[PDB]
Amino acid sequence: EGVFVSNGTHWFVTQRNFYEPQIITTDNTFVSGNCDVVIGIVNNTVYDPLQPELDS
């Protein structure tokens, strides 16, 4: 979508031109490489919509 931001306690994705945070998920984010390569990377969960539903 846009940009990662934090309010100091939680991380969100938001669109670049109007602050509107959403939870970070497999659907608004995509993978490349691994955690060693990127400069200034940080740690958080990324939520999966699928597994908690397909468990039941």
Ligand X SMILES: *[C@@H]1O[C@H](CO)[C@@H](O[C@@H]2O[C@H](CO)[C@@H](O)[C@H](O)[C@H]2NC(C)=O)[C@H](O)[C@H]1NC(C)=O
**Of ligand X, a second copy, another protein, none, which one does residue 10 interact with (CB within 5 to 8 Å by kind)?**
ligand X
Q: What mask of x and - would describe binding to a second copy in positions 21 to 50, judged by CB under 8 A?
A: -----------------------------x
**Of another protein, a second copy, ligand X, none, which one does residue 32 interact with (CB within 5 to 8 Å by kind)?**
another protein
CA distances from 22 to 3, 9, 18, 26, 27 (A): 11, 14, 12, 12, 11
How far is the C-alpha of 45 from the C-alpha of 23, rounded, in Å?
10
Give the interface with another protein as residue ranges (CB under 8 A).
Answer: 3, 16, 32-33, 37-40
